[PDB]
Design a protein around this ligand. Structure first.
Ligand SMILES: Nc1ncnc2c1ncn2[C@@H]1O[C@H](COP(=O)(O)OP(=O)(O)OP(=O)(O)O)[C@@H](O)[C@H]1O
Ligand SMILES: Nc1ncnc2c1ncn2[C@@H]1O[C@H](COP(=O)(O)OP(=O)(O)OP(=O)(O)O)[C@@H](O)[C@H]1O
Ligand SMILES: [Ca+2]
Ligand SMILES: [Ca+2]
Lengths: 539, 241
């Protein structure tokens, strides 16, 4: 049986769990072609890679398996949200969804196109000229012998605002229905398994935890989450300890006594009959997204461009958000912002300490006054402070390079000491820290990639056993982390249970299914590998 | 050779052959490795310099036009009228000034925008002088450390593992010069080469029982005859020495 055992490998999944016998077991199942084809895609290949950086670097150990299953569920929803968009009264509603699916299918194309046109407008805008005479001054656009250069500006302007407006609707139907599911799922856990609004209360902070108070009693709370029966489950858990009538009122659930008849007893016209509370709740969630706001603010400037001005010269900054590697250099400088603002703040305090000195002793020196009359930039104290700052730190050679010569007998020594310290402290030292807080950021951001690299190649990531134990066999750690534990079979298993029939589970598929409902993660190996288990008996 | 050919067309073309010191000298080529190790992420940084001053040109083109009058006396420069000159004034002079752009313009002592211009200049000195040219000076310091630890990895691993069976030296050193005799007599990285010269330069009907078994696997390109895990000492450590 070689032809069979070969043609069926890209489908013979293998997982390795423990439980119900206190020993490690092995399971087999069918991955299937449809699920497998959805796993190797650029939109998904990257999500896994960035996820591991968020675990082995800034994550823990006891909660690792918890936040791993959560991610393994965010992917199932993404595979579902994408496998559906692919290819006068009712004749219009059919072409809408057939068009929106085309809008979101190629979203990074539109997102890249608006970057292209921003280089076209800003290329043209490099010709404008000022003139106080028609060809109160006018901004006459200058042309190099070509007349059509300006009529093309009217064309590319309205074209740009178009694609800068379609990117919002594409983003609204593609990446929003997941910033909602991540929050719905997060709320249904703090009620079913905690007492966030039953036993305890939010800590008067974290408005994110407080804004959700107005979505509990809405008619359709779990709109995108799978378990739409979360209400009936919280009730049967705190209905006795707390007031059954009280709890069955906080979650809406009117006619709690008459909420058994549903199980007992089997278009542009009235669309105005929809909920308004939940819609406000969803609105408040979207508007506080750091990506939706920048994507919306990018549309406002492209809107004010019709109010023809130099506003398209601000759309070039999308190269920070656009380019892959350029955004990484900007990460280092933004990695120490909290401790770099407080450093330049230390620069507006030392020169103030150097102003009250030159305001009482060296007033007869700052006489920038040229000839005739008689500047005296030191009389008030809201000018020498603005002379030691606009000119002081920008001088480069201390402040002694803009004042009179100290050749005079009075304070010929007290002023040199005053200047040399001003060159060593607030020029060399206090601006080598700013230049030094960046050099440290690169080393602080380079060793991070080594930790997420030297740990993936040493440990199993599931049982934690180091590779030094597996390599007592040719390609020991090479075959283990690719057949026994694979970080993809453990995901292809959850797709297998949920997409199966409940009366079809085997003896082991059902035991792991019950622990998944109670959110008990004591079936991952975490310590053994079925080789450390049977190394004594046989191979 | 082409440049040395155009030298007969007598000119100053032999002044370009000196650059072979980069390809010639042993150590000088190593310093040039570091700077060339981050070229992909250094061109895209100086490209970020031709975009910020463009953002600083459209500002001084609408508010500070009455200041750039490099015009000396008489008549009346005005290097700000088009927008293909202030952009060439904030670049040829701007980044090369060293003290921001405020050291080549009129004094802000005038009442109009006495505050709006200082803020315009101080940011121009902190951003595109200190920050945006400490990255270029910083992408080189990182290259030396990025290219120095590499030599340590190729040095701290040759002196710890057998390179053939992978067993660390911490197991061999239970015997005086344990790892010293192992990696020089049992596995030697030169006998394994002197063996291939031995099989190919032998006669096919002369192979022994073991020289022929390894010869067949060499034809099929199967590399399952290297030890890779054992060392004949870990094998017989129980029976005898
Ligand atoms: N279940 C797992 N347990 C431990 N390590 C794993 C597991 N799955 C993947 N890895 C680690 O990932 C490495 C190989 O996969 P890697 O993360 O490089 O992605 P890939 O499979 O090469 O595909 P791509 O690079 O395109 O994402 C191995 O060194 C391995 O340690
Ligand atoms: N077969 C081998 N297995 C493991 N390490 C080896 C092997 N051959 C050489 N080495 C490593 O090389 C080191 C000694 O040789 P090295 O690479 O320094 O070159 P060398 O023999 O000193 O001659 P040269 O320095 O002139 O190249 C040892 O530390 C050893 O670990
Ligand atoms: Ca059954
Ligand atoms: Ca023979």
């Amino acid at each position: 049986a070689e032809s069979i055992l070969e043609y069926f490998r890209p489908y013979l999944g293998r997982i390795e769990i423990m439980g119900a016998s206190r020993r490690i077991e092995r399971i087999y199942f069918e991955i299937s072609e449809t699920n497998r084809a959805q796993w190797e895609m650029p939109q998904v290949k990257e999500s896994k890679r960035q996820f591991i950086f968020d675990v082995v670097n800034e994550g823990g150990e006891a909660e690792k398996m918890e936040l791993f299953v959560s991610f393994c569920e965010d992917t199932i929803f993404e595979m579902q949200i994408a496998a559906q968009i692919s290819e006068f009264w009712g004749e219009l509603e059919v072409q809408r969804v057939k068009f929106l699916n085309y809008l979101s299918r190629n979203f990074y194309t539109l997102r890249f196109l608006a970057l292209f046109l921003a280089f076209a407008i800003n290329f043209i805008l490099l010709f404008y000229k000022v003139s106080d005479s028609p060809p109160n001054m006018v901004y006459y656009f200058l042309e190099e012998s070509t007349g059509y250069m300006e009529p093309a500006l009217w064309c590319l302007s309205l074209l740009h605002t178009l694609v800068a407006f379609l990117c919002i609707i594409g983003y609204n139907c593609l990446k929003v229905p997941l910033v909602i599911f991540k929050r719905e799922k997060e709320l249904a856990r703090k009620l079913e398994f905690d007492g966030l609004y039953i036993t305890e209360q939010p800590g008067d902070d974290d408005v994110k935890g407080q804004w959700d108070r107005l979505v509990l009693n809405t008619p359709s709370f779990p709109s995108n989450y799978w378990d739409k029966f979360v209400k009936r489950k919280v009730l049967d858990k705190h209905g006795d300890i707390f007031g059954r009538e009280r709890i069955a009122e906080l979650l809406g659930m009117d006619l709690a006594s008459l909420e058994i008849t549903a199980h007992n007893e089997r278009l542009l016209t009235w669309l105005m009959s929809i909920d308004v509370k939940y819609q406000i709740w969803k609105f408040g969630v979207i508007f506080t997204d750091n990506s939706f706001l920048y994507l919306g603010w990018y549309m406002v400037m492209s809107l004010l461009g019709h109010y023809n001005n130099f506003f398209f010269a601000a759309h070039l900054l999308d190269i920070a958000m656009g380019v892959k590697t350029l955004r990484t250099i900007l990460s280092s400088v933004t990695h120490n912002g909290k401790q770099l603002v407080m450093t330049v703040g230390l620069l507006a305090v030392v020169v103030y300490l150097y102003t009250v000195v030159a305001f009482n002793f060296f007033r007869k020196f700052y006489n920038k006054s040229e000839d005739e009359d008689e500047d005296m930039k030191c009389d008030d104290m809201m000018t020498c402070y603005l002379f030691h700052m606009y000119v002081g730190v920008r001088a480069g050679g201390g402040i002694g390079d803009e004042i009179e010569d100290p050749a005079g007998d009075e304070y010929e020594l007290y002023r040199v000491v005053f200047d040399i310290t001003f060159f060593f402290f607030v020029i060399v030292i206090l601006l080598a820290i700013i230049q030094g807080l960046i050099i440290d950021a690169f080393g602080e951001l380079r060793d991070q990639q080594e930790q997420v690299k030297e740990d993936m190649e040493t440990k199993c990531f599931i049982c934690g056993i180091g590779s030094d134990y597996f390599d007592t066999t040719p390609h020991g750690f090479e075959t283990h982390t690719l057949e026994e534990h694979n970080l993809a079979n453990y995901m292809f298993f959850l797709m297998y249970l949920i997409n199966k029939d409940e009366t079809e589970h085997t003896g082991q598929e059902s035991y792991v299914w019950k622990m998944y409902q109670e959110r008990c993660w004591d079936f991952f190996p975490a310590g053994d590998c079925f080789r450390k288990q049977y190394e004594d008996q046989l191979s």
